Amino acid sequence: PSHKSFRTKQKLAKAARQNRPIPQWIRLRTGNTVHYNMKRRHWRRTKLNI
Amino acid sequence: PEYIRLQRRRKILNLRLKVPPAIAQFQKTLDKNTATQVFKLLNKYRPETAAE
Amino acid sequence: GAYKYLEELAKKKQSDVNLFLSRVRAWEYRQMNVIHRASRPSRPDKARRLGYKAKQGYVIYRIRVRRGGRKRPVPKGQTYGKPVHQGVNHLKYQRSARCTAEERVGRYCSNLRVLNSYWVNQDATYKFFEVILVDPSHKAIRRDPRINWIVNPVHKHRESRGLTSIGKKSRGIGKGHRYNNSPQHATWLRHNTLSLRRYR
Amino acid sequence: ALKTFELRKQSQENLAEQLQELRQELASLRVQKIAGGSGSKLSKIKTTRKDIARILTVINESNRLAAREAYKNKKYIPLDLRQKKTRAIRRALTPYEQSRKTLKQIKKERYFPLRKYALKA
Amino acid sequence: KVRTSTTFRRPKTLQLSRKPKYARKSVAHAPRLDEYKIIVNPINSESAMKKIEDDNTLVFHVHLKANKFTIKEAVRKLYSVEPVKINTLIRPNGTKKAFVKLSADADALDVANRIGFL
Amino acid sequence: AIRPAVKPPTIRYNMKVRAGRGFTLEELKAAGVSRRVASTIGIPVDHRRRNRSEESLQRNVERIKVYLAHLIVFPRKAGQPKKGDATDVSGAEQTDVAAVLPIT
Amino acid sequence: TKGTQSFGMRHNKSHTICRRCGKRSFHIQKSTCACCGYPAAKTRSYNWGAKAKRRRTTGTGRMSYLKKVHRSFKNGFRSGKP
RNA sequence: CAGAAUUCCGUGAAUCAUCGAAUCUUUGAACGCACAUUGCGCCUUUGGGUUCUACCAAAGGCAUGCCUGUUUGAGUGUCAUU
RNA sequence: GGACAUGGGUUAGUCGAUCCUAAGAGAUAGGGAAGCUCCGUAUGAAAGUUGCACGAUUUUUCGUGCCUCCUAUCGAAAGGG
RNA sequence: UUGACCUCAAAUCAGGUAGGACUACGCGCUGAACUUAAGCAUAUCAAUAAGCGCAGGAAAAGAAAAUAACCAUGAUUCCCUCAGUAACGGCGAGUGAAGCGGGAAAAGCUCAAAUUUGAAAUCUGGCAACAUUUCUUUUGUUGUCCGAGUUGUAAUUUCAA
């Protein structure tokens, strides 16, 4: 609400960083089948729950 | 404080609360002259010290 | 020695001297805390018999424990069951007040090991016990062969596990037919375990 | 890469100066990486970090060895310097304390020890 | 032994200080948060370049546990420039940035060129 | 270790002979073995059992005598056979006690 | 009234992030975590919940020091430089 | 994918294996007080800004219960020559 | 396009929090409870921070001198400031 | 006035110690109900589930205030058997051990109660020295001093004596 604690802001920063597209080279690694990921979170679909 | 109050009240309770003869036979010790004579003759026969 | 005289005099608890001493000492203990360190044992001969020694590493604590039975800690006497389990008022705690006293002293002095305890006084409300404790971190204890056993970790909170004299008395440990269920769980497990051998 | 045996032959002040220079080089490498750089120069960042770790490690051994020398044959020494076994092992009875015996037990062992014996058919 | 008050209070004792027989830690830790551990890297975004050119303020990426007192000291120790004011910002990505304005006698453009991120 | 021969304590088994826990003090004294040395040489000592009959006393005493006769006692110091030690410990081997002294 | 329109006034957190276990189970008014029992000096655990026990138990996390202890034991807890 | 020939007649590449020396952020029994706050303090030493006392920075510390000793104490508790 | 991808963006001695206390929460002493823990907040506690110069080369907060109803903290982004 | 003793305090005093996690097995406390009895209250489920306290590599138990009634056995523990037996039980449903015997393994002991009284001979801590190491990380010895201790630390004894 624009009035957030330091812990809340750090958690939001962590959530934002864990939302980026996956680089393709890691998926192309031999023996690595990361490929597509359903871990992607949208602000309007799945809430963080603090 | 508690310990000062307890020890003073203990002395009062012992002074009252009639004591059985086995314990009441105390509180009447040697007089001044007899006690100092006993200790004077006692101080000669001291049971040595570590140095000696 | 005076220890024999002390032992014989402690038996005569109904004598005038013993009754007077009990009264003044019960008042003395009631004016103190529930648990308090005793500088020296009030019954040196009893402490010696139980294992206390007048050397560094031995600690004596005096504790008063409330007397009576164990009321069922249910809110309004409601047990929510069959009538056989509806008793609330005339129930008894399976461990003795001496066991409770030594366990509370052990919690109070968790750095020490409980060795034994002995009754010293009682009234209507409280029963008074003196508990002997041994310091396992003291060198005088760690170098004494006769008390060296208690340093070992297997004797940690022996009063909590009922390994003291009164603890084993409450557990019912004994020899003979009168103690057929000496260890209750071990005996029950042996008698209720179905042994299915491979017939080959 | 910096050699540990070469680092161990230098004084603490020289090692501190080397550490400062390496940190400055690492900062410059990060600056160039941010504002455009080549993979050949970027690969030096890991080597610089490892060299910084090596210098800090060597300084640590020198400091700890000096502390051990100072606390040699002393009754009480720092907790990090002393034993690092398990907690139960540390507070367990020492072999000397466990082998302590009373005079009666010592006399019994001396006069009636277990004998070596054999039987014949 | 005359007491003019009915309340008993604990008398004052010596209360001597600690004289340890051994240091708990053998080696004192090296000072955390040094100058190289206060500055990470300069920020060379378009807004940062506008600040440098038009306002004589350098935009640096500083650690999260640094303050303006230590940022000023580190900037002085690393680039030999005396700041006049420092503003601290924490970006939504969890990292801190510092706007460090320089005095009139110092030029942020030349300082930035000396650093080498331009 | 060598064990004594005892009679089981019931009419269902009093006609048999089995192995006991240890030799009584009276048996050890009759056989000439001290209670402290019996443990050292491998003779168990049972302080609870008693010899109510000369039959049981003699039965166990002969067992101790046979064990002593067949026993080799190594000297405490090698090459210096003391009182009771054997001077011919060269031919020593591990043998079954019941193979020479079984329960009969 | 008890349903959809009543759900529109739910904007006051009852629990927040716990400082010990990190779950959003720290009751704000009671100052107690519903998951791990913080700030009580004991981790909340019950035998009727075994799935909850295995969710948060030894081996779930990093085991940074237990692995070092196991490695030290296998060599016999030796010290010094060869 | 590269990069690395500062590599190979070399105490040397590797997300290799082993592993006895170290590093080990904020926390957590968690321990200066708290914490829906990266909030509020205290002590010692060393340095920077005019600062023998204020401010800043760094290093080392400040929880409770209990044990054995140390020091300083209290008591119309018991005892002696002054 | 509030979608997807790549980058950028939140700058305080003066705005709030931080300070205080409210309803309340909650340590400590002490007392219960087999115990997890419950009651309790100057409570039946030896619960101590403030005030003068006694000594000091000399124009100054440290060793003592007898004090006197001080007192844990948390608790408001709409209360006070 | 002082010292000594006794009791009780304070210190960020010197050195230590406890908490917490793991619970398959182990030692205890507390403790149901579903269910069976073709209903149901005693009983059964069960001295169990849940709750609480406490250890180790095992724990507990353990060297008879034990059995037996015999030609007597002989610490504890575990397996077979005793035995679905003696016995308990609205004698309803159901519950239910122990001695002996065979085997696995075997190991014994320690204090308090004694006057050393021709010598507290006992122990901790500080300091210093000398040794030792799974190890500069561990463990000791000697000397000296201070404390503990005569309201009893050492030695011979523990009933088998």
Ligand SMILES: [Zn+2]
């Ligand atoms: Zn939690």
